Amino acid sequence: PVAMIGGSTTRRYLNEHVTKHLLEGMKLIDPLRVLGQFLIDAS
Amino acid sequence: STTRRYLNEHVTKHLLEGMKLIAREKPEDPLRVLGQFLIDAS
Amino acid sequence: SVPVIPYLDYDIVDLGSDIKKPDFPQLSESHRINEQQYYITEDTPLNKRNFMYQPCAANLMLDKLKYCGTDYFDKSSINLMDRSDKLAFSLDDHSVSVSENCGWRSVRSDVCMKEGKIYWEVEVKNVSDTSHIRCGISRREASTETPVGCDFYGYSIRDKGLQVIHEGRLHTVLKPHEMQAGDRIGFLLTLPSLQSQSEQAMDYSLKRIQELNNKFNKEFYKFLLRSCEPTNVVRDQIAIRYKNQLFYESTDYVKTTKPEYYDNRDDMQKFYELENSSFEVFVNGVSHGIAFEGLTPFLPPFSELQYNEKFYLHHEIRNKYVNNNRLGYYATLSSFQGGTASIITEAMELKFLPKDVDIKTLNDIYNEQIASDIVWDLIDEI
Amino acid sequence: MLQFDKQVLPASGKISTSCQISPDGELIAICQNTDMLVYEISSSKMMKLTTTHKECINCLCWSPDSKCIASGSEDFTVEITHIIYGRIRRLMGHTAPVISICYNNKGNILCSSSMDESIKEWHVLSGTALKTMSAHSDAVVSIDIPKFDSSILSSGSYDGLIRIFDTESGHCLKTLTYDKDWIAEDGVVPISTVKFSRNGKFLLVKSLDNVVKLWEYTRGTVVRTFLWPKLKYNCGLELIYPQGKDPLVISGNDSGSMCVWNVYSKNLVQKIDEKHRNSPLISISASYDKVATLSLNGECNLFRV
Amino acid sequence: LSLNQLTKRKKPVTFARSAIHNWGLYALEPIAAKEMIIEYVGESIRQPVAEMREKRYIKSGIGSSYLFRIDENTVIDATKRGGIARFINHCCEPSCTAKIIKVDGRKRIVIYALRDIGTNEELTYDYKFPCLCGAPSCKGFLN
Amino acid sequence: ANLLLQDPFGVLKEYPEKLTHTLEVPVAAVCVKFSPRGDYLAVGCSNGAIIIYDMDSLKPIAMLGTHSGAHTRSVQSVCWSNDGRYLWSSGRDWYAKLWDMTQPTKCFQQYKFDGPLWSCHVVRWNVCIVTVVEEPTAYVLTLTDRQNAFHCFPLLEQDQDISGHGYTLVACPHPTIESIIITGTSKGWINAFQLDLEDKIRCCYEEKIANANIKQIIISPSGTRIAINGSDRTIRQYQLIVEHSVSIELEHKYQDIINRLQWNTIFFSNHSGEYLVASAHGSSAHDLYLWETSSGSLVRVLEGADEELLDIDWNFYSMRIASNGFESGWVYMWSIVIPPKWSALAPDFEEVEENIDYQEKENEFDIEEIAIDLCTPEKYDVRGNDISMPSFVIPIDYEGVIIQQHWA
Ligand SMILES: C[S@@+](CC[C@H](N)C(=O)[O-])C[C@H]1O[C@@H](n2cnc3c(N)ncnc32)[C@H](O)[C@@H]1O
Ligand SMILES: [Zn+2]
């Protein structure tokens, strides 16, 4: 995937799971609620 | 610097604490738990 | 101004593949203790000349930045980047040592202890009367060439007598005990929280900006000390390729004077101490006392980066007194003439862990650190 | 022990820096301001020999054949003087006062240390200089060639150093102490007098804190130390060898007091605070069975084992 | 142009009193051009141990540093154990330099002559960190 | 003596290697011989003179026979007594002179042979062996207590037959028996005799070892080894056993087959004669050869002089070599020259040739009644020579300087 190409510690899986969604959020950013909610919408 | 200033003031602190929560024990909807975590702040 | 180094074919890895892109280093057989092979790394750049290194991998998710820090091992363990080239290690049990003909050498854990209460244990494997070891704690300024404690950047305890070592001097403050080849020594390191450590440093900044400025150029330095955010992280990293491997090269801290301040109220020079900081050592669960209480603080002007002030003074600008998310105390281990010892990180393999819910195993703060790393990798892109 | 035999001179007069019995042990040479007095002991007669020194003199030495007397003076010169035929040679190399001199075993060479920090070798029969060993950083105060080996030469200096030179090459061979460049710069004790044993296996020095030690210079260790139960004058010292096998040391204070120790032991066996009360002791010489002492003032006393 | 072995046997120099400082290194025969005089030999110590020693020597009031640096990690310490090469005094217009030849994986310090040198002349080599050298167009400061 | 006890790491240099002094003798030197100790040097000259140099200054101090009884023609041998007080002399004026150094001015006692002498080897201060030119036998020359007269007997058994053995060219007394003498004749015959010390002398050995002139015979000062120089370009080295009886066993020969040269003089090292020195006659041969004797290998060459070298003496106290040149007449001198050790400027210095890898202590980064004797002598120095025997000191000529005071 793009996760193991980017190094690998087991507790570095966050790249597989939540990093892109989060990066996708900040660029948008305006209280935290904008991100807090957008963090729910994708899933 | 303006953009970094904004993020640092408000978001950065609680983003780090929420991030290191899933890092110790992982849920199954890790996105949503964080989303819950951030809302609870404001 | 400067572009990121290109991607290359051995960086790309697709789904079907199973190779692990933290490309492990090539080792060299160094010596043997107790019928176990200890290896040194042969062609990876080790921390030296005030530069620190960390293996990085290709992260296509970042377009501005192209590479992000990754770690070699699955769990927490020694940072193979800051050792002496002659400090070997065994992948079987992660014990470390130097050959029986070598002087003092050191290694630091890969996790940086910033605040809270952290517990772990040292397992000693071979400590004869010719093979000594020293378990302790150190900041980034300490040199892995010297045994932890010979400078004021480190705190350690000796193997024979369990004496205490700081600034190179010995003290018998802890309950005497001489380590045998199977003990398990505990270390509970309590530090104040970052917010309380942050003002102790902003105050130190503010005292120093003008009180000691009423060296030729006061103006520029004062600008630097005002523009000093200890909590917020500004990191300096450039991706380089060293012998077809991929590492991040960052600037590191240098030794300086020991911070002092004159207190008019008591009328005497006082040293700087972290509020309520404590370093408690255990022997098989049973405490032998507090090693230190007044641990020096490290957050911003307490720790100065490597700095080409000749360049920035001429002139958009960087800071000496900046945090790169690697400020704190690393569990340091030192070996002398075959003295070997191991460092434990995960709760499941601690024999005598104290029961408190706020304390965290080194693996926990590791995990807490990786998360803090990738987030900080995130912001820098923007 | 030593009884008292005969006084030899009164106190009044010029300086009396040195005094030595001749190797044959019948005549005693004492010095005054640019004058020299030999005293036959069998008859107690005194003879006056005048030298051409133009300033006070500081040291004496008999030639082994007991017919000459070498004298070094403040005007930077050394002179061999035949007791009968007068002065025979005048050497004239040093650039500073001559403080210590010592003959050879065969009497053909004469070494003379000075305050120019050098040690110069002189060939008597041709009166020309042979060597110059400038291996000190302060006044070279004392030198001695052992009695039956003319191969080594001691040197004591105010720089604190006790070196041992090779006569033929002039190179330093062994030092036993440190100077202002290698220890606490205020911890150097200046040396005042060196003297070998009779067999040349042990070297004996006197520091300017009135400490007298016996060295085994080959290894570089002290084997006996004799302490008094700082100074201003190079007080005199000598090793007495009575026919009784146990030998004795003797030293001197800026008061005219003398102790004598047994060297094999370290216990004091006699003390003489009676004589030389006014002045400091500078010279103590001995012979088969006699001891001669001499304060700075002309007083010179003889004793007998 | 000589094996480091050959340099160990031929000896073109000795020590003797010097006007510059207490002891100095002098030539006994006209060595000329850019040939191997002598190797600077001593105790090979690490960088940190050099820092421990350097303060321990100043503490004892030595006032003289016989420490020659190989590279950033090791230095040759000839204060107490070394060779006569330890007697070369500093000047800013010197007659010698020193380069690092490596033999059998180990670095060694070889002193070459910058210019022709006559007999009974003091070999002299800049130190590259006060000054007593006598040269006219000279740095008055040791540094 | 003691100096050699400050330099030894169990070992010392056993041979000098550097030419230090070149004595410019006014007359041509023909033979050199140190005093028993290295104090003085007797230099026999071509005109008959015998200068005596003081070794501490390299300057002459006397010359023998200047008022009475010097040599009229070239002196060919000088030999000190063990005391250093007397000196034996022999020249082409047919005289064998014996000198008392208390009276260097006049010959103490002399004797005119019937022809020129070759050499004169001392056995005792009063007894010495003489060798004559063109004579079949040597002669033993003995002094009497009524000291004006002399005894001289041929060194031959009562009726020994030596028909065709040649002339007796050189002799050599035994250093440690004091009663055995070796004589080498002209046709290569080696003999050994034994003295009574009456004249009933008896032969103890006879073997033709070569077809050549025996040029010289020398004996290691401990009687273990003996070497022979021959008219053929070869030195022969043997092992000597004397018990009397006598037996020689050949160890090595010595040649320079490439250079094809003869040897003028040979000399041995101190005790067992582990080393052997010699002087070359060949043209352009300006150096002294030195061999080991256990394996007869050429170990070194003494390269000081630039002319033919022709007598040799080796004093084991001063460890110096003396040799006289052919063309210049001067005396060349080799000594041991040890560089100065800087390890002798402080008591805790040490000099080293190659770097030392310091072993780091564990604390590398952390903060009398001995048995004494001051009088008893030492009967040997580090080299093993019998110190503690009275050696002569030639007194300072006080009555000569007081005249020199007036510019001579
Ligand atoms: C290589 S050693 C020179 C040997 C020294 N002369 C001796 O007697 O041991 C270097 C030391 O000598 C001193 N030094 C060297 N050159 C000097 C100079 N030109 N003037 C004053 N001191 C000098 C310095 O203090 C230095 O630590
Ligand atoms: Zn200069």
From Swiss-Prot, chain E:
Protein origin, superkingdom: Eukaryota
| Annotated transmembrane regions | none
Q: Which organism is it from?
A: Kluyveromyces lactis (strain ATCC 8585 / CBS 2359 / DSM 70799 / NBRC 1267 / NRRL Y-1140 / WM37) (Yeast)
Q: Which family does it belong to?
A: Belongs to the class V-like SAM-binding methyltransferase superfamily.
Its domain description in UniProt is:
The RxxxRR motif forms an adapter helix that bridges the nucleosome and ubiquitin.
Could you tell me which residue ranges the Post-SET domain spans?
A: 130-143
What gene codes for this chain? SET1
- All copies of domain SET, residue ranges: 11-128
Q: What does this protein do?
A: Catalytic component of the COMPASS (Set1C) complex that specifically mono-, di- and trimethylates histone H3 to form H3K4me1/2/3. Binds RNAs which might negatively affect its histone methyltransferase activity. COMPASS recognizes ubiquitinated H2B on one face of the nucleosome which stimulates the methylation of H3 on the opposing face.
Its subcellular locations are:
Nucleus; Chromosome
Q: Which residues bind S-adenosyl-L-methionine?
A: Y127
The name on file for this protein is Histone-lysine N-methyltransferase, H3 lysine-4 specific
This protein's assembly is summarised as: Component of the Set1C/COMPASS complex.
